[PDB]
C-alpha cells in the first residue's frame, strides 16, 4: 500500500476542519448560550480539556482505539506512536494523518460535553472525568465501531459517528445534567461547526473519492432540510421562527446525517434532514444541557434511518451482501442501545470518581 | 473522462470555503452594519434563505442551470440529481462536487441580497422573492454564462461571476432598496469573505492547476491594491482612513477581480484592484444597501477590464483565436447590459408577487 | 520538473490558512488585548499594512527573497513576477503558488508587529517602518534561511520560521516597545491562529507527504503540551488557571514547534511543547507588547531544541550527514544571534527614519 498525495492533502485539511469545530466552534456555540459570568471559565475548561485529549490520544488513545486487540479494545503497541514508521500507510494515506484525523473526533466529542457542563463543575473534577470517560467510553466505542470491534464485526453502519460522537456525548452530558445572552455568538459557533463538519463528514471517506463527494452533498442537503423542518415546526407551534431555532435546526440536520452521509442518496438526506429537524425540536421541547437533547435524539434518529436509506431501492449505496433492511435495522438498534448503556455507565463512574476525589459541584 | 482525486480534494475544500462566505461571512458583515435591534432577524433570514437555496438547488436548480437545454435554461432531466451516476465526471471532478460547488455560488449571491434587505422586508415576502429570483434570474444567468448558454456562446469572459453573482445581486438589491454599531464584526465578516473568496476565485478553475494558481495570486494582489486605492482616496477626500473604508476597499478589489482572476497577469490584477477601490469609493459616495454600490460598480468595472487585461500583450492568457480587444469589450458590455436588465426585471416581478401575496414591507 | 496537482491543491489551501492567521486571526487576538478605544485604529493599521506587504511582495519582495543572488539577498530578475512562466515549477508545485505561500509568511510576520504597536504609533510612521523593515529585515533573513543564503548554506534548521517569523518579529516589536477588555475575542483570535497554523507548519513541507503529516501531528502535540505546561505553571504560581494563560500557552507551543515540526518525533514535540509553555510564562512574567515575550522566548527555545530533537536517537528525522548534535546546536545559536542583531538594527533604523520624517508617536 502506497500513500496517495491527493488523499493525504484532503485528509490533513479535513482534520484541521474538524479541529476548527472544537477550537473555536463548540466554545463559541456554548459561549453565547450560557450566562455571561461563566463564559471565561467555560472557554478555559474547553481549551484545557482539548489539550488533555490531544495528549492522551497520542500517548495511548490511538493505540487502544485503533490497534488490533479484541472486540472492545486495541493494544498498547502504539504508545506515543512507537512502532509506526513515518512512511506507514493506513488505507490510502500516511498513518500519521489517520492518527490526527481520529484524534480530532475525540476532541469534538469531549468539547460537546465540557462546553455544556463547565458552568456547574469544578475544574479539577472535569479533568478527572475526561480522563476516565475518554479512556473507558470514547476509546472502546471508537474501537467497536471503527476499529474492527464488536459493532463493525456485526456490520453496523455509522459513517461519521452518530454513535461514537453524538449519542456517546449526549448520554455522558445527560448523566452530568442529572447529577442566551449572545445569540450572534451562538450563530457564529453554529456556522463554524457547519463549515468544519464538511471535514468531519466528507473526510470520513478517508479519500477524495465519490463517497466523499456524496457525503459532502448529503451534508449540505440534510442541514438545509433540518433548518427548514425546525423553522416550520417553530412557526407552527410558536407562531414565528427564531435565530436559536434556525441554528438548532442546522445542528439537528448535521447530527442526523452524520451516520448516514456516505451511505444514502440525496433524497434520503432530505428526508433524514426534515425528520431530524422536527425530532430535534420535539426533543428540546421535552427533556445549555438541552443541547444534548438535539445530539441524543437526532443521533438516534440518524442511526436508525441509516438502516433504511442505505438501501439501493431508496437511492443508497446498498446494504452489504446478504443483509436485509430488517436485519440492518436490528443491528442499528443494538448499536444504539450498546452505546447508550456503555457511555451512561462509564460517565456515572467518571462523575463519581471525581466527586469522591475532589468533589463534583463547582466550589 | 476519469476523476482526478487532487482536483476532487481541491474542489470540495473550495466549496466549503465558498459556503463559509455566506455562513457566517456575509451574515457578520451585514450584522455589524445594520441597527442592533435588527441583527437577530437578519441572521435568521440569512440562515433560512440559505437553507431554501440549498434545497431548491438540488431539487431543480442545478438541472435547470447546468443541464443541456437552450440559450437561456437547461432541462429537468437532473431533478433531485436523478440520472447522475455517483461516479459521473464533470471536467476532472465527480459531478456531485460540481453540483455542490455551483450551489455554493447561488447561496452567496442570495446572501448578498437578503443580508441587506432583511431589515425592511417581511419574512414570508423574502422567501417568496428568493424562490422567484433564484429560479428566474440566478438560474438562467448561470446557464447563459457558465452553462453553455447565450453569453458563453458569444465568448463572454467571466471567470468567477462578475455578472452571475455581483452584478446580478447588486441590481436585485438596488431594486429592493428603491421599493455601523459594530465595526469589529464588519471587519470579521470582511475577513471571512476574503479567505472564503480564495475558494470562490481559485476554485473557479475546476482543477488545482496553473490557472487556479494564477487566480489565487491575482486575488491576493487585486484585494491589496483595492484596499490601498480606497484608503488613499479616503485620505485625500476625508483627511484620514477608516476601518469601514479599508474593509470596503478589500471587497471592491475582490469583486473587481472576480471576472478577471483566471485571465489576467499580476500587473493587470494590480491595475484592476486600484481602479476598483477608487470606483467603489466613488460608487458609495454617490448612490446597508450602499453595499450594492460596491458590488454593482466594481462588478461592472471588473467585467469591462477583463475585456482589456485578458490580452496577451498586457500579460493576460490571451483572447480566443480571432478575437480582437475591441470585439471582446463589446461582448463584455453586452453581457453586463443583459445581466442588469434580466436581474432588474425579475427582481421587480419577485418583489411585486410577494407584495401582492403577503405584503412586502415588514409589519 | 512537473507540478503535482495534489501538492498544488494542498499548498493553495495552506496559503489561504496562513492568510487567515493575519486576516482576521492576529487582528482579533490583539483586538481583545488592547484598550477598546484603540481597537478600530489597530484593525485599520493591520489591514492597510497587510495590503502594503502583499503589494511590496509581488513588486520586488519575492524576487529579492527567493531569486538567486548572494548570501544575503536575491535579485531583481522577478520584479512583478516578470520572467516567471505561468507553468514554471518550484519543487513540486507551480511557482506562482510558492510566491503566494511565501508572501503569506511575510504578512503574518508584519501583522505580529503592527497589531501590538498600532496603539502608540502614527499611521504614516507605521507604513514607513513596514517598508524599511520588510525590505531590509524580512527579505534578507528569508533569503538567508529559505532562499539558499548564509544560514541555509551552514545547515541551519528552521522548518517553518522560528527565526524568519517569530524571533524576527519579536525583536522588531521589542525595539518599538522600548522607543484585556474582551477575552472571548482574544480566544477567538487564538483559535484562528491555531487552525491557520496547520497551513503554516504542515505547508512548510511544500508537498502533502509524510513530512507534512509529521509537522501536522507535531503541531497538535506541541500546542497541547504547551497549553498544559503554561496552565500548570499558572496553577502553581497563581493558584488557578486563566483563559489568557491557556491562550498564551497555545501560542507558546505553536511558536516553539515552528522551527522543529518537520524534523522531530512526537516525543520531541511533547517535550518542546511543555518547555515552551513554561518558558513563555517565565518570559511574560519577566520582560500588548508582552506578546513579544512569548514569540521571542519561545522562538529561541524552539530554535535551540530543534538542534537537539532532530537527532535520530531522539526520534527525529536525523541531522545531515557528518553533523553532530554539538555542531548543529552551534549553528542554531549562531542563526538566532544573527536574526536578533539583524532585525534589531533594521527595526531601529526603520523607527528612526519614520520619526525623522513624520514623527513616531501617535499625534
Coordinates of C-alpha atoms in Angstrom, one line a residue, chain B residues 96-303:
Chain B
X96 CA -21.6 15.6 -7.4
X97 CA -18.7 18.0 -6.4
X98 CA -19.6 20.3 -9.4
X99 CA -23.2 20.3 -8.0
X100 CA -22.1 21.4 -4.6
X101 CA -19.6 24.0 -5.9
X102 CA -22.1 25.6 -8.2
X103 CA -24.8 25.6 -5.4
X104 CA -22.4 27.5 -3.1
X105 CA -22.3 30.4 -5.6
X106 CA -26.1 30.5 -5.7
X107 CA -26.0 30.7 -1.9
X108 CA -23.6 33.7 -1.6
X109 CA -25.5 35.5 -4.3
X110 CA -28.7 35.3 -2.4
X111 CA -27.0 36.1 1.0
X112 CA -25.7 39.3 -0.5
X113 CA -29.3 40.4 -1.2
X114 CA -31.0 39.1 1.9
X115 CA -28.4 40.4 4.4
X116 CA -29.0 44.0 3.3
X117 CA -32.8 43.9 2.8
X118 CA -33.8 41.7 5.8
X119 CA -34.3 44.8 8.0
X120 CA -37.1 46.2 5.9
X121 CA -38.8 43.0 4.4
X122 CA -41.4 40.7 5.9
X123 CA -40.1 37.2 6.5
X124 CA -42.7 35.4 4.2
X125 CA -42.1 38.0 1.5
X126 CA -38.3 37.4 1.4
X127 CA -38.9 33.6 1.0
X128 CA -41.3 34.3 -2.0
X129 CA -38.8 36.7 -3.5
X130 CA -35.9 34.2 -3.2
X131 CA -37.9 31.4 -4.9
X132 CA -38.8 33.8 -7.9
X133 CA -35.4 35.5 -8.2
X134 CA -33.3 32.3 -7.8
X135 CA -35.4 30.4 -10.3
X136 CA -35.9 33.1 -12.9
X137 CA -32.7 35.2 -12.6
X138 CA -29.8 33.3 -11.0
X139 CA -30.5 30.0 -12.8
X140 CA -30.9 31.4 -16.4
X141 CA -27.9 33.9 -15.9
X142 CA -25.8 31.0 -14.6
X143 CA -26.9 28.9 -17.6
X144 CA -26.1 31.8 -20.0
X145 CA -22.6 32.4 -18.6
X146 CA -21.4 29.0 -17.3
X147 CA -23.9 26.5 -18.7
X148 CA -23.2 26.9 -22.4
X149 CA -25.9 29.5 -22.9
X150 CA -26.2 32.8 -24.8
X151 CA -23.3 34.7 -23.2
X152 CA -20.8 31.8 -23.2
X153 CA -21.7 31.0 -26.8
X154 CA -20.6 34.6 -27.7
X155 CA -17.4 34.2 -25.8
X156 CA -18.1 36.4 -22.7
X157 CA -15.3 36.2 -20.2
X158 CA -16.3 35.9 -16.5
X159 CA -14.1 33.6 -14.6
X160 CA -15.8 33.6 -11.2
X161 CA -19.1 35.6 -11.5
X162 CA -18.8 39.3 -12.0
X163 CA -22.1 39.0 -13.8
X164 CA -23.7 35.9 -12.4
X165 CA -23.0 36.9 -8.8
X166 CA -22.0 40.5 -8.2
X167 CA -23.9 42.5 -10.9
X168 CA -26.9 40.1 -10.6
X169 CA -27.2 40.6 -6.8
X170 CA -26.5 44.3 -6.9
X171 CA -29.3 45.1 -9.3
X172 CA -31.7 42.9 -7.3
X173 CA -30.8 44.6 -4.1
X174 CA -31.0 48.1 -5.6
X175 CA -34.5 47.4 -7.0
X176 CA -35.4 46.3 -3.4
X177 CA -33.8 49.4 -1.9
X178 CA -35.9 51.6 -4.3
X179 CA -39.2 49.8 -3.5
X180 CA -22.3 50.8 11.9
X181 CA -22.9 49.8 15.6
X182 CA -20.2 47.0 15.5
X183 CA -17.2 47.6 13.2
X184 CA -15.1 44.7 14.6
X185 CA -18.0 42.5 13.4
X186 CA -17.9 44.1 10.0
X187 CA -14.1 43.5 9.9
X188 CA -14.6 39.9 11.0
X189 CA -17.2 39.3 8.2
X190 CA -14.9 41.0 5.6
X191 CA -12.0 38.7 6.7
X192 CA -14.1 35.6 6.4
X193 CA -15.4 36.8 2.9
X194 CA -11.7 37.3 1.9
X195 CA -10.5 33.9 3.0
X196 CA -13.5 32.1 1.5
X197 CA -13.0 34.1 -1.7
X198 CA -9.9 32.0 -2.5
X199 CA -12.2 29.0 -2.9
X200 CA -14.6 31.2 -4.9
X201 CA -11.9 32.5 -7.3
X202 CA -9.2 29.8 -7.5
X203 CA -11.9 27.0 -7.4
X204 CA -13.4 28.5 -10.5
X205 CA -10.6 26.9 -12.5
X206 CA -12.2 23.5 -11.6
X207 CA -8.7 22.0 -11.0
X208 CA -5.6 22.6 -9.0
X209 CA -3.6 23.8 -12.0
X210 CA -1.7 26.9 -13.1
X211 CA -4.9 28.8 -13.8
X212 CA -6.1 28.2 -10.2
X213 CA -2.6 29.4 -9.1
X214 CA -3.0 32.5 -11.2
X215 CA -6.4 33.3 -9.9
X216 CA -5.1 32.8 -6.4
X217 CA -2.2 35.2 -6.8
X218 CA -4.4 37.7 -8.6
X219 CA -6.9 37.6 -5.8
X220 CA -4.2 38.5 -3.2
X221 CA -2.9 41.3 -5.5
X222 CA -6.2 42.9 -6.5
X223 CA -7.6 42.9 -3.0
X224 CA -4.4 44.5 -1.6
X225 CA -4.4 47.1 -4.4
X226 CA -8.0 48.0 -3.8
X227 CA -7.5 48.4 -0.1
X228 CA -4.7 50.9 -0.8
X229 CA -6.7 52.6 -3.6
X230 CA -9.8 53.1 -1.4
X231 CA -7.7 54.2 1.6
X232 CA -5.7 56.7 -0.5
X233 CA -9.0 58.2 -1.9
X234 CA -10.4 58.3 1.6
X235 CA -7.2 60.0 2.9
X236 CA -7.4 62.5 0.1
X237 CA -11.1 63.3 0.3
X238 CA -11.8 62.9 4.1
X239 CA -8.3 63.5 5.5
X240 CA -7.9 60.1 7.1
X241 CA -8.5 56.4 6.5
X242 CA -11.2 54.5 8.4
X243 CA -11.8 50.8 9.2
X244 CA -15.0 50.7 7.1
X245 CA -13.1 52.2 4.2
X246 CA -10.4 49.5 4.4
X247 CA -13.0 46.7 4.6
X248 CA -14.9 48.3 1.7
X249 CA -11.7 48.5 -0.3
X250 CA -11.0 44.8 0.2
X251 CA -14.5 43.9 -1.0
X252 CA -14.1 46.3 -4.0
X253 CA -10.9 44.5 -5.1
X254 CA -12.4 41.0 -4.6
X255 CA -15.5 41.9 -6.6
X256 CA -13.5 43.7 -9.4
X257 CA -11.1 40.8 -9.8
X258 CA -13.8 38.1 -9.8
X259 CA -14.5 38.1 -13.5
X260 CA -10.8 38.5 -14.4
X261 CA -8.7 36.5 -12.0
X262 CA -8.1 33.5 -14.2
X263 CA -7.5 35.5 -17.4
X264 CA -5.1 38.4 -16.4
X265 CA -1.5 38.9 -15.4
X266 CA -0.5 40.2 -11.9
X267 CA 0.1 43.7 -13.4
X268 CA -3.5 43.6 -14.6
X269 CA -4.7 42.5 -11.2
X270 CA -2.9 45.4 -9.5
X271 CA -4.4 47.9 -12.0
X272 CA -7.9 46.4 -11.7
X273 CA -7.5 46.4 -7.9
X274 CA -6.6 50.1 -7.7
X275 CA -9.4 51.2 -10.2
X276 CA -12.0 49.0 -8.4
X277 CA -11.1 50.5 -5.0
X278 CA -11.5 54.1 -6.3
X279 CA -14.6 53.3 -8.4
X280 CA -16.1 51.6 -5.3
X281 CA -15.4 54.7 -3.2
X282 CA -17.0 56.9 -5.9
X283 CA -19.9 54.5 -6.1
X284 CA -20.8 54.6 -2.4
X285 CA -20.2 58.3 -2.3
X286 CA -22.9 58.6 -4.9
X287 CA -25.8 56.2 -5.0
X288 CA -26.7 48.8 4.3
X289 CA -27.9 49.0 0.6
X290 CA -24.8 51.1 -0.1
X291 CA -23.1 47.8 -0.3
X292 CA -24.8 47.2 -3.7
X293 CA -22.9 50.3 -4.9
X294 CA -19.7 48.4 -4.4
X295 CA -20.9 45.1 -5.8
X296 CA -22.6 46.8 -8.8
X297 CA -20.0 49.4 -9.7
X298 CA -17.0 47.1 -9.1
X299 CA -18.6 44.2 -10.9
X300 CA -19.2 46.4 -14.0
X301 CA -15.6 47.8 -13.8
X302 CA -14.2 44.3 -13.4
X303 CA -16.2 42.8 -16.2

